[PDB]
Amino acid sequence: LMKTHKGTAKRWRRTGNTFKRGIAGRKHGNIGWSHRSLKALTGRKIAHPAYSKHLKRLLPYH
Amino acid sequence: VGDANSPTRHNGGRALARTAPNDYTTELPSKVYSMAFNNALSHQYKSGKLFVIGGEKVDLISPTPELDLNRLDLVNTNTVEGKEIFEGEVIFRKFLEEFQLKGKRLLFITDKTREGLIKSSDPYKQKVDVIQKELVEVNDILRAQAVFIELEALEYLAMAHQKEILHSVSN
Amino acid sequence: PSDGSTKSFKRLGRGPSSGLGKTSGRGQKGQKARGKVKSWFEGGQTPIYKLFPKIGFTNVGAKPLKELNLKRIQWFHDKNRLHLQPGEVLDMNKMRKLGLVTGPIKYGVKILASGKFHYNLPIALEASRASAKAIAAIEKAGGKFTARYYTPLGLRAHLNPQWFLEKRGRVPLQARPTKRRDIDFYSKEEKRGYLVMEKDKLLQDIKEAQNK
RNA sequence: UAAUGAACAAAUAACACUGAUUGUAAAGGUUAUUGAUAACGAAUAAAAGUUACGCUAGGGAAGGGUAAUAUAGCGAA
RNA sequence: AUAAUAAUAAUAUGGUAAUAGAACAUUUAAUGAUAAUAUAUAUUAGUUAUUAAUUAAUAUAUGUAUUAAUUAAAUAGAGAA
RNA sequence: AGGUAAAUAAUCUAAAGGGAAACAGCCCAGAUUAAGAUAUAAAGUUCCUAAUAAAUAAUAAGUGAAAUAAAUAUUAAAAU
RNA sequence: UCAUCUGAUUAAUUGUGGUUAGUAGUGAAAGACAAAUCUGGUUUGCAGAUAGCUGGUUUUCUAUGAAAUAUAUGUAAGUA
RNA sequence: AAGUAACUUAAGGAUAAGAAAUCAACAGAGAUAUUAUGAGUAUUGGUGAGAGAAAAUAAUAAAGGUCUAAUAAGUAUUAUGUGAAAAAAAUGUAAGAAAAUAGGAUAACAAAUUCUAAGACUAAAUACUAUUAAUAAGUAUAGUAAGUACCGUAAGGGAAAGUAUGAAAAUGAUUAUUUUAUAAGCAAUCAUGAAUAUAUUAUAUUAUAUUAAUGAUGUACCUUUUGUAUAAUGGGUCAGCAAGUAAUUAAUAUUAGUAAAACAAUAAGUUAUAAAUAAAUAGAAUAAUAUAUAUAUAUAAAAAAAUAUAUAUUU
RNA sequence: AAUUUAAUAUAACUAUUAAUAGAAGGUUACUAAUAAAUUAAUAAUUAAUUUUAAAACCUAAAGGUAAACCUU
């Protein structure tokens, strides 16, 4: 039987009929940049259709 | 070339070979199985090839004959202290030719084991099958060209393969 | 067979005019032609399971509750499928027995208020908890709600007590709350906690401990 | 309009979210922040040569085109 | 308010990689008459818009079909290694 | 350079059929199966090879006639 | 094989037995020999090692029908 | 990969395990051994390739609970080097207790629970092999010979081969019909004379079949390529054999059963029934359709972004 | 008084299920063999339960070897 890919499990979560994720690029080198601009690098986004199929295969039981 | 086992060789192995015991089991919902069983029984009844043999638990408006029985069995078989043959098979053949069904598939569904019937129908094993109510199948019923079923066995099968209803009070 | 219940599996490598001939769909050459490569391998670039950060943690102490809205209760009532004798309480056992809450109940049931505007049953209710709107609607309809604490074994005993009676001759005693979260929740009055609503001995023991 | 670097693993602070018998802890999480992978979408914390003794699987990722060069002629002088 | 066949007007019908429908030959399992005035195989000549079956003649074997048809399955189709 | 690098068509790739003598890429045209009466595309009509009769000038060098070779030199044509 | 040439009392040539070898022997040293050939022999097993490479992949009919570009990649014969 | 292959050693019809210094969580269970759910969840990883439980509920199983020990000391524990990918009892070196007024179990401490190491026996459900019976959408290339012939010094490798029939092809000789000694290329198609053969409606001025007069057209087939008649790959010919299959899973589509329920029906358990959040004790109309409501960010509360729920009958 | 179907042999293997149980080869030659008993069955055959006779040489370990040899 297939096994959940734990890396994807830790970096992705199931929401509705798709998956959520965190942002990339706000863990160092933030000083000198605009806070009102870095605001866009805080929070979550949704999976993209280009890789929805990959995610479905990587997390069979999600 | 490599080893001598290659499938491309005369004494080589077989590509993508199976390994017994091969698994061919399949599963089907119980409700569908019950519906199919009811359908087979209904088909036999509609074709007029389902005979019901029973009594002693329902009111009879015509008395049973002295020679006959109310059960799907043939008594007086083990009494073989006569000639090379005894009464059981003789009565079975007489039934066979009286009802004009000799090389026809026959099915006998019973409640409990009927050793007399089994012994008497042993000579015609090629065309007559005897089964208890527990072990019958749709293939047996549909294969039989004449199906005999005891009344209690029919009661049991009907109860088992019954649609379930709860409450269901409506105007 | 019934129409639309069977097809023909596509047969590979059995002639040119079959449409699936020598290449049999593989294409021309490559690793995929005569080899196996992961479906989610993308040639080296940081994968979708590496670029993003690991977010969140799994709460092992979680207690998911099966949700029960008021519209279902009212619907059962109007369907005459809610068989309660007069002066009888609708608890999780009866929800399971009647069919209000179906399937396995791991931890408990929470009553939510979606059909609150049409709920008019003056019956009494029990559950692990309920929403504030559910409490308000239940009381407005002339009913009564209290939230009770069950462990896994205690809830099993509550749902299927005859199992314990048959196997062991006795139903286990319901366990007293032991955490801080449970005691706090069931001591709250706005949650209709059973400890406070029935003034039971546990809170008194805690008070005698503090006052010493 | 350039002035830049992913995720893992560490570290500091705040938050009051979870605290694996309970209580506190430990640890994790959320928010903010730090250090550069310049082959700059970054294999590992960590790695150069030689074979004319060489081996396997493959691809070829004098003729043909050109006339810069060479040779030869022509015009003009 | 379908299905089959036929009729009229209009549009469309090249195809590698690839996608999607449909069908035939072989073998096996379930149901399954008929029979040497038949069945099976082979050759020659005809028929059906024909990878297949059929009709006639001839030859061999056999009192004879896992037969026609519907399903279920494949060691199910070879000028390319 | 029948080179190399990209930018618009088109075709080959994966396109049979007619013309380019022969011809992946050029000119025309896209084969479901036949039939063969009619109108044709590109290309052609002395014979090989399906199909033509004319007008007005020039060429005399087989120049040329389905792959135009340059500077220059000679000999010839009319405008005032 | 024939002819020719070299040592021919020695660091000689041979017979019969024996010991040393597969990370491993012997070697007047040539990567030489270890059962017709070794920069490390054979047999069996792991084992259907692995191969982004090469070659094969079998009947018919019908309808639609591409690409050889961008980005990324220890990536340019692969893959997304 | 894997404590696998291999080598070595030692038992028995079986071996091994086994009646808690076990689980669990304040309520409780009560020995081993396999199987299903739990569950690919907790846990774990150059947090990469990947690995991965236990409680608890069921199934198989036997009478399954017993005393044999003066009740266990260089032992528990500690430090250190190793040690089943998560989970741990053994293990080299060296220090080293206590007596049920005690000891083991959790990173640590307190409280509470639970069990008593350093002494032991134990059917059955299981593994392998050999007979007997039953069923084969299994085998006559998995149908009895032979580990023989033969190959190697050796370890070792390792054949063909039942009976009858047989107008199967490749291949050879001969005969018959027809064409062929002034004509040049994938050997074929079309056009068209002529000879021959058969024909129980050839009535014939007939039909069909075989055959290089003669004319036109025609650059073998696959593979791999931008592109091959290519002097690029493969093929002396024919017959037989030769290649997308199995489980264990996830997603999607069609039909069929049932349907706010479905599958099982011993208990469980898996989907669906509520959206959301990293998570927490939060969770959908104040007398109506987003302008209301739920969650997340922010809270006096709203507004603002994103999803989601409400217009006789619940999807 | 025949003749065909379907099972069955001392005379195949493979897979599963269910029972029962934990059983000589080679060499060639002074060739390697048997005998009986019991009760119940119209001098006795049921078979099946007990007794027995012989059986060379070799297959590491009475000693040695070049296996079927040799020496005690």
Ligand SMILES: [Mg+2]
């Ligand atoms: Mg952060």
Ligand SMILES: [Mg+2]
């Ligand atoms: Mg901006």
Ligand SMILES: [Mg+2]
């Ligand atoms: Mg194709």
Ligand SMILES: [Mg+2]
């Ligand atoms: Mg390619």
Ligand SMILES: [Mg+2]
């Ligand atoms: Mg290929």
Ligand SMILES: [Mg+2]
């Ligand atoms: Mg490909």
Ligand SMILES: [Mg+2]
């Ligand atoms: Mg890289």
Ligand SMILES: [Mg+2]
């Ligand atoms: Mg708090």
Ligand SMILES: [Mg+2]
């Ligand atoms: Mg704790």
Ligand SMILES: [Mg+2]
């Ligand atoms: Mg912290």
Ligand SMILES: [Mg+2]
């Ligand atoms: Mg790099």
Ligand SMILES: [Mg+2]
């Ligand atoms: Mg780069």
Ligand SMILES: [Mg+2]
């Ligand atoms: Mg970039």
Ligand SMILES: [Mg+2]
């Ligand atoms: Mg490096």
Ligand SMILES: [Mg+2]
């Ligand atoms: Mg040299």
Ligand SMILES: [Mg+2]
């Ligand atoms: Mg087409």
